[PDB]
Design a protein around this motif. Structure first.
Motif, PDB file in Angstrom:
ATOM      1  N   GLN A 136       0.822  -1.196   0.000  1.00  0.00           N
ATOM      2  CA  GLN A 136       0.000   0.000   0.000  1.00  0.00           C
ATOM      3  C   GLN A 136       0.882   1.282   0.000  1.00  0.00           C
ATOM      4  N   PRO A 137       1.493   1.617  -1.130  1.00  0.00           N
ATOM      5  CA  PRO A 137       2.294   2.873  -1.103  1.00  0.00           C
ATOM      6  C   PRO A 137       1.392   4.093  -1.076  1.00  0.00           C
TER       7      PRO A 137
ATOM      8  N   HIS C 195     -10.106   8.714  -7.348  1.00  0.00           N
ATOM      9  CA  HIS C 195      -9.030   8.031  -8.076  1.00  0.00           C
ATOM     10  C   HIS C 195      -7.765   8.859  -7.937  1.00  0.00           C
ATOM     11  N   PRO C 196      -6.600   8.179  -7.852  1.00  0.00           N
ATOM     12  CA  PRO C 196      -5.304   8.809  -7.848  1.00  0.00           C
ATOM     13  C   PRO C 196      -5.066   9.647  -9.082  1.00  0.00           C
ATOM     14  N   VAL C 197      -5.535   9.216 -10.256  1.00  0.00           N
ATOM     15  CA  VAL C 197      -5.380  10.023 -11.465  1.00  0.00           C
ATOM     16  C   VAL C 197      -6.314  11.248 -11.494  1.00  0.00           C
ATOM     17  N   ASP C 227      -9.195   1.239 -12.933  1.00  0.00           N
ATOM     18  CA  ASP C 227      -9.638   1.967 -11.759  1.00  0.00           C
ATOM     19  C   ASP C 227      -8.896   3.298 -11.510  1.00  0.00           C
ATOM     20  N   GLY C 228      -8.227   3.831 -12.536  1.00  0.00           N
ATOM     21  CA  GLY C 228      -7.395   5.026 -12.373  1.00  0.00           C
ATOM     22  C   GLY C 228      -6.407   4.947 -11.236  1.00  0.00           C
ATOM     23  N   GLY C 229      -5.915   3.722 -10.932  1.00  0.00           N
ATOM     24  CA  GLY C 229      -4.990   3.474  -9.841  1.00  0.00           C
ATOM     25  C   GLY C 229      -5.497   3.205  -8.417  1.00  0.00           C
ATOM     26  N   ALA C 232      -4.042   0.398  -6.405  1.00  0.00           N
ATOM     27  CA  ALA C 232      -2.588   0.357  -6.272  1.00  0.00           C
ATOM     28  C   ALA C 232      -2.025   1.005  -5.021  1.00  0.00           C
ATOM     29  N   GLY C 233      -2.755   1.900  -4.384  1.00  0.00           N
ATOM     30  CA  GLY C 233      -2.264   2.456  -3.134  1.00  0.00           C
ATOM     31  C   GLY C 233      -3.169   3.555  -2.637  1.00  0.00           C
TER      32      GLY C 233
ATOM     33  N   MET D 160       1.706   5.632  -7.829  1.00  0.00           N
ATOM     34  CA  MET D 160       1.197   6.627  -6.881  1.00  0.00           C
ATOM     35  C   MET D 160       2.022   7.924  -7.011  1.00  0.00           C
ATOM     36  N   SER D 163       1.202   9.746 -10.206  1.00  0.00           N
ATOM     37  CA  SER D 163      -0.230   9.766 -10.214  1.00  0.00           C
ATOM     38  C   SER D 163      -0.888  11.038 -10.823  1.00  0.00           C
ATOM     39  N   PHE D 217      -6.735   4.635 -18.491  1.00  0.00           N
ATOM     40  CA  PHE D 217      -7.268   4.712 -17.136  1.00  0.00           C
ATOM     41  C   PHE D 217      -6.619   3.642 -16.229  1.00  0.00           C
ATOM     42  N   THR D 219      -3.322   2.283 -14.191  1.00  0.00           N
ATOM     43  CA  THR D 219      -1.999   2.499 -13.612  1.00  0.00           C
ATOM     44  C   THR D 219      -1.873   1.704 -12.346  1.00  0.00           C
ATOM     45  N   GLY D 220      -0.675   1.248 -12.065  1.00  0.00           N
ATOM     46  CA  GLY D 220      -0.430   0.455 -10.911  1.00  0.00           C
ATOM     47  C   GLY D 220      -0.977  -0.928 -10.994  1.00  0.00           C
TER      48      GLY D 220
END
Lengths: 236, 241, 235, 234
Positions: A136-137, C195-197, C227-229, C232-233, D160, D163, D217, D219-220
């Motif tokens: 989880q970064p 979303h992160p993006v 999911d636009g990231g 991922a975190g 991230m 991002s 859309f 990433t990661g």
């Protein structure tokens, strides 16, 4: 008492380090404790060894001196580690060599030597201390070298768990959130707390308890145990 | 003062409490001086005054009500809940009947859902709690030759809501966790099957009741863990063997 | 009957209609369903109106599809509901509705379809879950999306393993917040920020993900996040 | 005007499939490997080098900037793989794996990323391996898990970090791929290492990379192209 199990703990001088030394002693293990800087101890069941953990030579010394002193090695807690928060594009060859030395070679070398000793006894426990940043970064906490370096430790924990599966050696990891140490200035606590869904920082006892739970949990290998106040569970 | 401390002890509700894992959690919770509301379809009352027994179908809203009502009535508080009631079916997915579907949905999902809603209402009210569910490592690591689509559906659900509710209850002092066991040696697993069931783990041996019990009690006292899934499974989740 | 056939659930609004069109463009015949779907002019789209929670709807769908087109090759489980609501507030009616659409909806057709795909020794089953399954959010209370879709992610890996040696592939697509008409431009600003993006998804994003899984013969048991990231975190 | 992609390990079979597929899409290509002969094609610039060296990253990026004026995409495909009991691994196994697998991703990614950050737009994809998330008894490879496993996690970490900057970062985690390195007498054995019971083809990984390349859309994400390996136990 010559019957007691022997644990090798690295980064033993730091805040989680001492806590681990104390707790393993409290649970009737003899300790080989190692640090860059560690000084010899009054306790006759705590053998200290000083050295640069990233050097193959240091690992050779830890185990050799541990066998000579106590007769065996049963557990290993990989707690030597550096963290660096820095934009990825700003990191230097020096940042790289330093993280790959401590976080990677300083795992790899004793882990290899300690594992030899355990494989031959048919019994053992390797636990590494990792970071919830791997899984989880966070936006706002740039630490590409931590993810690289600790993420390799998560994955190699699972890999060695399989490789040593029928050998009696168990391989685990504890992934903490932000843990209150002295080396964390008092002023920084409001915001560091806010890094966890529960809104508190971790305490050393939290992590030390996780390690000791895994030490005694004979059906657990390949496990990554998060002690992170919710960090890995979702987005807050 | 010691008498004061007894009459004000933490209280756990344990579902599926009659035998195996559940009956072991009851005893282990008693050993750390919790009081216990033990439920099962047909649990007999206990001779221990700090175990209250409640017999009922855990899949019904009305049973969940009762458990908490009688819990409060007898001990005044509710601190923790272990969702241990669970059914498990091994069957090719294309052969699973409406009856199989209802049975698993009921015990595994509605079972969990109603009592959890009521226990959490109390925990929120007092601002602290622990909710733990027993799941399966088949959620994260299913296996060729162990067809169990319903276990994945229903237990995979519990895994996800465990993280969902850990986020929702983040600021409330309520921790939410799961224990995901491998194949655990129980009386209901006859001796003939033990060597086969053992090779269902990288480590080549069966889990014990003691393993699963200690994981729950470790989560119970680990005040910095929420939303965690702790696999107690002889390495099943780690990789392929 | 050389054209492959896909069944698409929740075909009416949103992703589902995007999906009909995409699969048509790749030369599939389509059986399309939802509560309200209307008959099509297109001889290669056959519509079936019905409540996907009921086993009867699944029975109609598969048999009507085998009648017109002679086979079933793919299933896209896209019917689904979503309820933002504090967990202690959810009602019996909230529970039945989500379990009915999200879980029973999946189960009946997947069972009937999988049977056809197994006899032939080929098939693809893809389900649309949500990134809240792996990455739930403070301030987005949805216990029921988690029970419901989390079971779908897990069942996806489970059936992937079970159909392993048979030539039937099972995958899932897990979108972030996707821009339908259903979201007033009032909401867009707020939702982008989940979303992160810092961007909402388009229908195109999810649809291309489904079409990619459908032609990727070596992928099974995969959850593809679009999911636009989010997964991922932490942002 | 055309987009520009850097592809490492371009002499390998996956490497060469990627070169063609990106050209089929009208990208210009900077292709590196330890040994690669110059190109006829004005649209493919080849750079010979050992990627374990920072010096090499510097050269690749500046040469692509020299020739084509921009870098849009980076594909990290350089890799080695060692099957050996952990306890038998030598200093030389170690330095080799760390060199090609970690250093060989890190420097090139750092340089390509500086360029993408300047234009406000980009794509980084890395080719890892299913053994990171699904290691296998009887496939001892601690170094692969150590090196590629860091890659997976940096993949999510940089997604991230970048991002709000317009750079997407993703990974493709393949199973065992049919390559000249794997002789035919072996295929039937490698097939059995996927629940699906066949090996992968070059195109399975190549399509996965190209899909992520066109999916704005995403990433990661680690995309598993592995015959079901990551999904469970077979």
């Amino acid at each position: 008492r010559n019957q007691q199990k022997v644990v090798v703990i690295t980064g033993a001088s730091q805040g989680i380090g001492a806590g681990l030394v104390r707790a393993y002693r409290d649970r009737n293990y003899r300790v080989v404790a190692t640090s860059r800087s560690i000084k010899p101890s009054a306790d006759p069941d705590i053998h200290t060894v000083a050295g640069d953990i990233s050097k193959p030579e240091t690992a050779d010394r830890i185990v050799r001196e541990g066998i000579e002193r106590f007769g065996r090695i049963d557990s290993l807690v990989n707690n030597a580690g550096v963290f660096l928060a820095k934009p990825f594009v700003e990191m230097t060859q020096e940042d790289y060599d330093h993280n790959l030395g401590v976080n990677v070679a300083g795992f790899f070398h004793i882990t290899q030597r300690a594992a030899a000793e355990m494989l031959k006894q048919g019994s053992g426990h390797i636990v590494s201390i990792t970071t919830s940043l791997v899984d989880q970064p966070m936006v706002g906490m740039p630490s590409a070298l931590a993810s690289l370096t600790k993420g390799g430790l998560n994955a190699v924990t699972r890999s060695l768990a399989m490789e040593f599966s029928r050998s009696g050696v168990r391989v685990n990891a504890v992934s903490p959130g932000v843990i209150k140490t002295p080396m964390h200035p008092a002023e920084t606590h409001s915001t560091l707390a806010g890094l966890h869904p529960v809104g508190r920082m971790g305490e050393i006892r939290d992590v030390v308890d996780a390690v000791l739970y895994l030490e005694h949990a004979g059906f657990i290998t390949g496990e990554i145990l998060h002690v992170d106040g919710g960090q890995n569970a979702g987005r807050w």
